Amino acid sequence: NALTGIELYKAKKYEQAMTHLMTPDAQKNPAAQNLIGYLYDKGLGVEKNAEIANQWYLKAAEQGFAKAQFNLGLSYEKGTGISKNMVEAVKWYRKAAEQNHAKAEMKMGYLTVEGIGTQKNYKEALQWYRRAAEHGDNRAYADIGLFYDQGNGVKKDPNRAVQYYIMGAEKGDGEAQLFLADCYAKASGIPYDADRALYWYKESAKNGNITAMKVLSGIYKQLGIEKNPEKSRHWLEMAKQKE
Template identity: 40%
Template sequence: MKPITILMIFIGCLAGSGWASAGSPSPTPQAKTANSSASLFQSAASAYERKNYPVALKIFTELAEQGDADAQFSLGVMYDNGEGVPKNASQAAAWYRKAAEQGHAKAQFNLGVMYANGEGVPKNASQAVTWYRKAAEQGDASAQFNLGLMYDNGEGVPKDASQAVTWYRKAAEQGDASAQFNLGFMYANGEGVPKDASQAAAWYRKAAEQGVASAQFNLGVMYANGEGVPKDASQAAAWYRKAAEQGDAYAQFNLGFMYANGEGVPKDASQAVTWYRKAAEQGDASAQFNLGLMYDNGEGVPKDASQAVTWYRKAAEQGDASAQFNLGFMYANGEGVPKDASQAAAWFRKAAEQGHAKAQFNLGVMYENGEGVPKDASQAVTWYRKAAEQGYASAQFNLGGMYANGEGVPKNASQAAAWFRKAAEQGVASAQFNLGVMYENGEGVPKDASQAAAWYRKAAE
């Protein structure tokens, strides 16, 4: 009755919807031109680490006003975070700028972040790019990653996948996990570089080993499909588990599927339910549908039609066609909900409009019988035809019947025979019998006793 959703294959979207955040004052300051300045800075840095912000603020301010770039940057951080002073993005940006203009890479990066987010300065993607570039050219990995994102998204610069790859690579080679993930994505999709599954897997692995859940999931997908790595269900399950344990809903769903089907792990319906539930509770429609199936069939949980309906509804309301069909079925049969033909038709229609063949057929039946909708042979034919054209045998048989009887369409024996044949070739016994009758009587086909006998035999078998 109800299909099991196949393993979802999904390559995640690019990382980096947010920006790397401003850091703490550097614990290893640049060398000072005067020993007294260096000593003062170390004293301030030590005070900061001890969270003695008043002392740190006093010394950093004194040094910053003397033009010390490290102190200017550190003072910017304190204003940015509201440490020892009221939080003040405008003051933070002002101090970052002073340090940035002296070539301080971390200040250049943070100033870029401020422009990107419109914090303390007007939002300005072009200025963000300018400051990211200055820091990136000094080797700052976070700035290289963010500059790659700007090229990737066409923010502040013309969109340029090749340039995005260049900057992602620089950051990735320094061990930046987000850049490693994005570089893997670019190789997986052939954006800015030739498509190369092996390289994609290699970069996903680097990010995955640093704990990036999206990379762990994508690496699992590559093992599941044998893309860039040998196909290995146990490795796929292992990487899905790592991502799933971090709360990645897609990984939770896929891990549930692996347990449901015994792929890469021992078959275990209870574990399948556990992981489907975790993903379902995060709003994953496929997991909600599959969890509904588990309740519907009593697999891994006690059979519970009411719970099945609950989860089908959640998925159906997100537009999942299979869930819409199953919810319609539950209403049609009064399973887990009061029997309601009108609701059944409404949900069958939603699934049918998405191309779900069984729903199209069922909606056709409801129009033919006037169940939940006004009786309308023409509408029945419309929906039977949609399902029949997708190869759904029952719909082909019913459509043949409509042509044979002139219901909803002009009577046409030739069309009746054509649709009966399609259903008959798929093994529908009633269609085989009807086609035999048509050959015996020469209706819609040339009269042919041997063909009639052949189709009667198939039906009889």
């Protein structure tokens, strides 16, 4: 039974989970096939073997299991157990993204912007990030705003870019809170507010910790704030130590 084999996986009983998933009725379950591949891919209960993992990913992916064709596209991108191939990764990332897979839609948006494994398409890449944001991945909101802040595929509208930064700032994204705090400083798409800029750099330290400290250590050395010695400098350690 496949359902009992998944409960054994949650209990880290990897050997007993493998036995239930190898049952003839469970071996035909794509969710069980993808889990068997994950065990060989990480070495849980067996030896780590990416080549055997891909054969189980392929079985479940050929049934249309989105989670599997994402794992298979990952093996093509990282070259684990197979030759690194970006054209084949996009082929499998697209199969999963068409089924509302959040991480796959993030992959599709990233590779379509850069042109890796597929033709560069700013129009289609913006569509992928919208679905990725709608399907859970809160990192997509900041990626969407860059299309409007730069005019890629759409008309350069700094006001629409801030709308997506705000949506990403509510849900706790460091990159979105970075752009929002920057929009409050340069008055891009939103009226200037020195207090709210600093307020969205502070919340950007609670959730995540990007290199807004390159701007933090720069304005204390601006925005209605008197130049602080300790501030303009203590922000540079966390900007250099994490580099």
